[PDB]
Amino acid sequence: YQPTPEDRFTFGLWTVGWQGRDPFGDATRRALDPVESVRRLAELGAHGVTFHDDDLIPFGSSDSEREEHVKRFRQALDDTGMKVPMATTNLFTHPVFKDGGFTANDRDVRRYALRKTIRNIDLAVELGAETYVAWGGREGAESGGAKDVRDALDRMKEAFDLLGEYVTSQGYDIRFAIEPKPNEPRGDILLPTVGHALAFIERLERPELYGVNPEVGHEQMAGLNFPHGIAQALWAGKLFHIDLNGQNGIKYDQDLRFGAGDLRAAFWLVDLLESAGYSGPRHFDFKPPRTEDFDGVWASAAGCMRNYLILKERAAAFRADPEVQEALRASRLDELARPTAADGLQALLDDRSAFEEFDVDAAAARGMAFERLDQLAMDHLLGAR
Amino acid sequence: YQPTPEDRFTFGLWTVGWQGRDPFGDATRRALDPVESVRRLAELGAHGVTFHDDDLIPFGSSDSEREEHVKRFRQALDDTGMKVPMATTNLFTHPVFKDGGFTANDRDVRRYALRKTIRNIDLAVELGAETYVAWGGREGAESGGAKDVRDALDRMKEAFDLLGEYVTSQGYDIRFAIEPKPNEPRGDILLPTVGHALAFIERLERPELYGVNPEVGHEQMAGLNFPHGIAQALWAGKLFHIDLNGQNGIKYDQDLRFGAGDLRAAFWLVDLLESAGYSGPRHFDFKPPRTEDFDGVWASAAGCMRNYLILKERAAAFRADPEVQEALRASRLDELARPTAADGLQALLDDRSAFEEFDVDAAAARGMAFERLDQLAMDHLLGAR
Amino acid sequence: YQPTPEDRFTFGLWTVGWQGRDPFGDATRRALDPVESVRRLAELGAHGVTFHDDDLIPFGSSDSEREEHVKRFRQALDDTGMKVPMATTNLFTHPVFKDGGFTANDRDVRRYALRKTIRNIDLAVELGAETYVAWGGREGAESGGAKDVRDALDRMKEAFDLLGEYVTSQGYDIRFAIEPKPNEPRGDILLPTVGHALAFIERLERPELYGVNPEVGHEQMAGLNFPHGIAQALWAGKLFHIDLNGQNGIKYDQDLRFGAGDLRAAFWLVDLLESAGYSGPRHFDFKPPRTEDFDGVWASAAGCMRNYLILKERAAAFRADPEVQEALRASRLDELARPTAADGLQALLDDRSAFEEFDVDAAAARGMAFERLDQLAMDHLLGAR
Amino acid sequence: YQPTPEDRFTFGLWTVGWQGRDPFGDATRRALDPVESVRRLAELGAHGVTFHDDDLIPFGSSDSEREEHVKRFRQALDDTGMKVPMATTNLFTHPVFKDGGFTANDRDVRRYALRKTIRNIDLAVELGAETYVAWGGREGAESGGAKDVRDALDRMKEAFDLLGEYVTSQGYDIRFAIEPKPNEPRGDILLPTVGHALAFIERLERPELYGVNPEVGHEQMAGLNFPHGIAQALWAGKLFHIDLNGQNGIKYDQDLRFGAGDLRAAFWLVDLLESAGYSGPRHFDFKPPRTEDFDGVWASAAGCMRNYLILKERAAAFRADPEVQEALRASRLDELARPTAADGLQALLDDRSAFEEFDVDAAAARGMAFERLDQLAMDHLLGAR
Ligand SMILES: [Mg+2]
Ligand SMILES: [Mg+2]
Ligand SMILES: [Mg+2]
Ligand SMILES: [Mg+2]
Ligand SMILES: [Mg+2]
Ligand SMILES: [Mg+2]
Ligand SMILES: [Mg+2]
Ligand SMILES: [Mg+2]
Ligand code: NA
Ligand code: NA
Ligand code: NA
Ligand code: NA
Ligand code: NA
Ligand code: NA
Ligand code: NA
Ligand code: NA
Hints:
Four copies of one chain form a homotetramer.
Chain A (H helix, E strand, L loop, with lengths): L8 E4 H4 L17 H11 L3 E5 H4 L6 H18 L5 E3 L18 H20 L4 E4 L5 E2 L7 H22 L4 E4 L9 E2 L4 H8 L8 E3 L3 H5 L5 H10 L7 E2 L18 H14 L5 E3 L9 H27 L1 H9 L2 H4 L8 H6 L9 H6 L4 H13 L3
Parallel strand pairs in A: 1-2, 1-10, 2-3, 3-4, 4-6, 6-8, 9-10
Antiparallel strand pairs in A: 5-7
Helix pairs in contact in A: 2-4, 5-6, 9-10, 10-11, 11-16, 12-16
C-alpha cells in the first residue's frame, strides 16, 4: 500500500506543521520550515501541498521578505516535483478577524479581508493552484443579537461576487470552493453544512465559479452522514475539492488522521469517490496529535495515505464480487436507477397498476435484503471473505 | 396573552390527536374524532388545522366512506370558521413505505407513492390549502450499500418535477414545501437540513413552486441554530411554512410544545419571524406527552400559543427600547447592513485605506460590545428591565 | 467464523422477535412464537435466550395459560440445549407505567411494579437465570417540575433494597444488573450512564448483589467511549452482563447488529472483554431493521456473532504481534502499570528527582509514539499486516 | 438585582483573565494583573476568587519571586475583603502534561504532577481555601491502545489516596472536589461525567474527603440533564463545589456566562440549589468571548451574577405560589416523597391491592397533569403570571 504522486495525495502546510497549541495547552513541537515539509512529504509519496497565505509568508512581512519566502518555496517544489493544487486565506487567526472577515460588522475589516484574499489569489495562480478554498471560520456569532444573518448573507454574497469579478477580469483559471463547518471557533458558523453552502452558491452572480470543499469531520460535528453529503455535492456538480480526516462524533473538531474516527464512513466515502470518478486532489486536513514528536508526525501523515489505499482496495473488491452484484440486484439497487415514470404524467395517472389495482400487501411483504448486503460489505472491509 | 384567529395559529390533526404510542409503549389516550379536534381547537383560539390524508380518511376507505369523512369535516370547518391552510401525505406509516415512497428501491412503490400524493393534492385544493408539505421520513437508509444517493436524488427530483407538472396542468394555486429532518425513523434521511433542501430545490424544473417547511426540533437534532437556518430560508425567498415545537438537544425527535426546549432560540426565532414580516401560518407540529390525559392535551396546545404571544411581546419590547437601539449601533449592526464595496472592485483595489494604510491593530482593539447587548436581550426576555 | 454454544452468545426474545413498529410506522413482520425463536437461534449456534416477562407470557394471562406458555418454552429449551442466563421485567410498555415503575409518582403503581418484578424473579430462578436485569426506561421526565430527583432516587433505592431482601430471604443465587440509558422514551432517564449506575449501587443496602448491564448504543447516545466505561465497570468488579449492538452516534436508539455503528469501538471492546477474561454471556440487544423479512432477521442475528468472532481474532493477533508488544513499550504502557509511588508519601516528598531536579523540558520532548501504535491497530483490524 | 458578598459569588482568575487565545486565533486582550482582577471583582459585588497555581505564580518562578507574588495578592485580598474559597492545580498547560498528570504513561511525570499539586495545597491552606479542585483535563486518550483504562484508574486512585494521606498527616481542613468533563482537550477524558466521578470516589481509601465539582457546560457536552446530575450528587452528599456557566448543546466547551445557553436548565438548577440549601460558593467558570474588550469582560462577569439573582427570584416565586403548590399535588409530587412500602416486604407480598386486585386500567387512565405544571413554571420564569 505504497503511495505515489499519481494517487494525488496532498497535505496542508498547517497539518504536519501544527505545533500542538490547543485551547488548554502550549505548543509541544517546534515550528517546521515549509521547505522541510515539502521535502519530507515528497519522500512519503505525496503529490503536493496547500497553504494559507500566512503559513508561507509570515504576517506583516515586507515585500522583499515575501519575495524571499516565495523563492525558497518555489525551489523546494522544483527540487521535489511537488505541486500546489489549492491555496486559501487565513481570515481567522489575527485579532482583527475576531468578528469575521467577509461578514465582520465593521465595514473597514470587511474591505481589508477582501484585499488580503485578492493578494493571495494572485500568488496562488502564480504557483499553479486550480482551486481557491474559503473557510469562513470566524463568520458567525455566539449570541443572537450580534449578527443579523440576512445582512451577513448579503455581505457574504457581495464578497464572493467581487472575488468572481476579480478572477474573471484577470483571466484566471481558478475556481472557488467554500468549506462549511457548523461551529468552532464561533458558537455557530454561517453556512454550517454542505447543504447550506450549496444553496448559497446558487444565489451568487456566477454560480459556475463556485463549489464546495467538504471536510469529513465537519459534517460529522453535526451528526450528518458524510458520504450522503458528498453524493449530493457530486449530484449537483459541485465537488471541487475535499478535506479528508477523522472525527469521533459530535465534539470539538479533532482533525484525526484519515481512517481514524468513523471507519465504516471512510469505507463508504472511498467507494463513492472512486465509483464516481472524482479526479481532484485527495487532500488531508489533519493534525498529528500533540502527544507526538516529529517521528510521530510523519507516521501519522503516512497513515492517512495508507488508510485511503487499503480502503480503495476493499471497496473495489466489494464492487467486483459477483456475490455482491447478485445481492445488489436482490435489494433492487438496479430498480432505484430506473426512472419512476418515463412514460410520463398522463400514463401514470391512467395506470391502474399504480394505484387502483396495486397490491400494497404483497409489495409490503417483500424484504429488502439490506442486512445480508451490509454483512457482505463488512466482510469485504475486514478482509474476511 | 389570549390568541385569536388573526394570530394564524394552526395545528395538525395528528398533534392533539397523538394517542401516545412510542417505540417502547402502547397508546395512553383514545383516538380523537377529527370533528372534535376542530371544535376544541377553535374554542382555544386557533385559526386552522392541517392533515395528512390518512389522518382524515382511514387508509383503505372506499370512495363512499371517503365522501362521508370529508363531508363531516367540511361541516365542522363551516360551523367553526376554521381554515385548512396546509395538507400533506402520509408516506411513512404503512409497511409498503418501509424503504421510502419517492425513493423506494422498488419502482412500483414509487409509482404508488406518487398516485397517493396526487389524490390528496386534489383534496387539499378543494379544502382551500395554499401549501402542500412533503416530509420524506422514510427516504434514507440504515446502511451504506442500500441506497445509491445520486440515484435516489434523481428519483426525488423526478417525483417533485411530476408533482409540479400536475399542479401546473390543473391550474392549481398551491405551492410545495419540503420538510427536512436529519434522522428518525431512518438511520439517515435524505435532505437532512434546511440547507440541503434549499440546494435540492434549485435543481428542480420549476424551482419557483417549491420552498421549505423547517421544523424547530429537526434542525436542533443536528445541533444547528434554527434562527440562522430560518434567516437563510428567508434570504432565499423560500420560507413557505414553518413547524413550531421544542426539542432538548441532540436526541430522538421530542416534538415538545413550543417554548419548551431551547427557550432563547424560541425568542430569537419569534424576533426574526416578526421582524421579517413572515405572513404564513404559525403551525405547531407537537405531541402532548403520553403522561397526559385529554385535559393535558388541551393545556399543552394552549401553551404553544401562549408562549408564542409572550415571546412576541418581549421581542417587540427589545427592538423598541432606545437603550437596545443604542447598543445595536455600539456593536455596529448598522455597519453590517451597509455594502462592503458599493464603490466597486477597482475602487477597492485602489483604496490604500483598505490595505496598505489600514491600521490592523487599532481595528483589532475595538470591542464588539456583544455581551452587553446580549444581557439587554436576556433582561427583556425575562421581563427584568 | 462459525459460532458454537461455547462462545456464550445469547439473544433476547424481543430482538429477533421485533415486529418493526417504530414511532412513525406499523409492524412489517408477523409475531414470532418464542418456541420458533429458540429453535432457529439454536440452529445458528447461539448458547441461550433471555426474556422479559411479557415476551414469554402475554400480559394478563391467567395462571393456567401462564403454566402452558412456560411448559412449551421449557420443552423447546430441553429439545435444543439452549439456556436462559438472564431475565428481566417489562416495566415500560403498558400505559400504567407511563410515569415509571419504581419511581412513578403514584404510590400504587410503584407497589404494582415491585409485585410484577418479584413474580418474574421466581420464574427466572426456575429457568436457571443467574442475572436479573433492570432497565428503568420510564424512570425520568420530560419537564423539570414533574420529578424531584432526590425523592425519585430514594424510591429507586427503596425498590432495589426490597428486591435484595426478597432474593436473600428466598435463598436465591441470582444477582441484579442495572442497565443505564440516557434518554428515550423519557426526555431524560434516571441513572443515565454506567457511571451514574455504579455510583447509585454504592448507596444500596447490599451493594454486592448489584452490578451493571451496559449497552453499547446507550453510552454512545451520550457520546461516551464505551470501552472506557466498560473498563471502569470491570475495575469496580461490577460488569455482571453486557448488551452488544451498534449505534451511529448521538440520535435515537438504533439497536443495530453488533459490529455496525462504530466499528473501531467494537474492536476495542472485544479486545478489552477478552483480555480481562469476562466470562459472562455475550448478549445481543439488537433490532433487525424493519426493511427486512424473516430471512433478513436470521441473517442479521448471524452477523452479530460473526462480527464478534472476526474482531476477537483480530484483537488476539494484535496483542500477540511482537511488533505491537515493542510499540506498547515504546509508548510506555508498561510504565502506566507500575505504581507511581510504592516508596510512599514521605519518600516522594524527599525525592528531589521528582520536583527540584526534574528536567521538565527533557520529559516534555519525549514523543508518546501513539500514532504508530494506532496504525498497527488499524492494520490488524483490517487484516493489512 | 444587585449582588453583595453575602451571595457567595466567586470567579476564577483565569475567567475574567482569559486573553482570548482559542485553537484558531491569537489573544485579543492583554494579560490582567491578578491584583487588578481582585479589585474589579470586589467592586462588582463578588465574594471571592479562585486560582490555579500557575495563574498566580508564573510557571518556573524562583522562591523569592513566588513570595512577592503571594504577598501582593494577599494585600489585595486584605484591601478588598475578598476571600479565596477554592484553589486548584494547572496539570494541563505545560507540554510535560501532554499525556496527563496523574495518569501519564511516564512514571516520572506522574511523580512530578503529585509534587506540583502538594506544593499548591500548602498555599491554598495558607490563603484559607476550604476546597481543592482537580480537573484532569489531560487524563485520557485519542486512540484505544494508548491508555489501559484499568491501569489508569489504578494510577488515579493512587494519586488521590496519596493526596488524602498528605492532608490528613498535615492536619489540614481542606476537602477535594473532582471536576468531570467528557472530552476536550483529550479525545475522551477519564471520569467523563458526574456519575463516573461519584463512582470512582467510593473506591478511594478515605471517600469522606472527596466530592464533585460539576460544571454546567461539561455535563451538557454529553447531552445530560445538569439539574438531574446535581440532584444525584446532593443525594450522595457529595456536592462540595459547583462551576456555573452556559453551553449551547453538544460541541466544544463554550464557557458562556451563566444564564446563557440552556436558560430553562439554569432555572431548574437554581431552584434545586436554593431548595436543597446548598451553602457553598456560587463559582463562575466562564470565558468572556474574545470579541469583547475589557468593558465587555466586566459586563459579562456582572451578567453571571445578575442572571443567578433573577432566576433565584423566579424560582422562589414559583415554589411559593399557591396555584403551583396545588398543581404539584395534582401531579402527585407529594406521593413521590412517601415510601413505597414502609409496611415492609412481607406486607407488600400479602397486599392483594398491590397486584391481584389492582385496577391497572383505572391507574393508567389518570393523567399526570405535567404540562399544566410546566406551563406554570414557564409563566413564572418569564414573569407572565
Ligand atoms: Mg477540521
Ligand atoms: Mg478543512
Ligand atoms: Mg418532529
Ligand atoms: Mg413537522
Ligand atoms: Mg438500545
Ligand atoms: Mg439493552
Ligand atoms: Mg468548561
Ligand atoms: Mg470548570
Ligand atoms: Na459571482
Ligand atoms: Na470520521
Ligand atoms: Na419542478
Ligand atoms: Na427547542
Ligand atoms: Na440492597
Ligand atoms: Na456502535
Ligand atoms: Na483516599
Ligand atoms: Na447552558
